[PDB]
């Protein structure tokens, strides 16, 4: 139960950290990916713009996973103004 709860909380910290970096310069919204070490573990993050039906909000997903192949532990979608 605790191992699981560690992974959830720590992947979630990395998600927030990477969303912050996107939010710094969001007009430049392009796909990227990388690695962040946190609590002794290397996490694999992905930033993905998210198609939109309206002209007012841009959207993007930040996903964090245990390997570059793995399904993500957490995905958070955020919206940015134009």
């Amino acid at each position: 139960t605790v191992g699981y709860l560690e992974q959830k909380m720590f992947a979630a910290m990395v998600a927030d950290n990477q969303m912050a970096m996107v939010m710094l310069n969001p007009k430049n919204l392009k796909a990227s990916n990388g690695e962040e070490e946190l609590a002794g573990q290397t996490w694999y993050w992905k930033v993905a713009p998210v198609a939109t039906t309206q002209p007012l909000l841009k959207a993007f997903d930040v996903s964090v996973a245990a390997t570059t192949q793995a399904s993500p532990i957490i995905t958070v979608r955020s919206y940015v103004a134009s």
Binding site: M9, D16, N17, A20, M21, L24, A39
Partner: protein, 156 residues
């Protein structure tokens, strides 16, 4: 062991919620003990570095001026504990309200984003850095870090 490791995680979640509440609400507002961000050894009587800044406490009822009530908070390490110190008024003569937030924290560190790179000090007194990284080295977990964005704007 399951109980104790479960209690440690819940302690960390509590710490994170509190730190989010503070560091995501940094106020572009100078304070003394003027700087925007105070970051120095033994600040707040920290064992190592201490951080202090003004933050938005709450919006006042709509009739009241000012609309925002600014408080002052700080973080330090005292005997491998992360402590949060809180002041109702940003211009305070001395003792703040102390909260022991997280045990077995060996180090507190703070880095500052200057638009291009992370750096170790912030001596710009008219603008905040665009981002702040708070790094805790826990005795069990090692390094955990949260990045927060600051409000835009300059003072004169």
């Amino acid at each position: 062991l399951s109980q104790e490791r479960t209690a440690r995680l819940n302690e960390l979640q509590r710490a994170l919620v509190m730190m989010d509440s503070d560091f995501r609400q940094i106020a572009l507002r100078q304070t003394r003990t003027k700087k925007l961000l105070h970051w120095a050894d033994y600040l707040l009587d920290s064992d190592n570095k201490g951080i202090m800044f003004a933050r938005l406490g709450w919006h006042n009822p709509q009739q009241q001026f000012p609309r925002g009530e600014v408080t002052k908070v700080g973080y330090r390490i005292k005997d491998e504990r992360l402590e949060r110190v809180w002041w109702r008024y940003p211009d305070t003569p001395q003792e703040g309200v102390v909260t022991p937030l997280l045990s077995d924290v060996e180090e507190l560190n703070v880095r500052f984003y200057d638009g291009k790179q992370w750096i170790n000090e912030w001596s710009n007194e008219l603008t905040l850095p665009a981002a702040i990284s708070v790094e805790l080295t826990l005795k069990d977990y090692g390094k955990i870090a949260r990045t927060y964005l600051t409000p835009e704007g300059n003072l004169q």
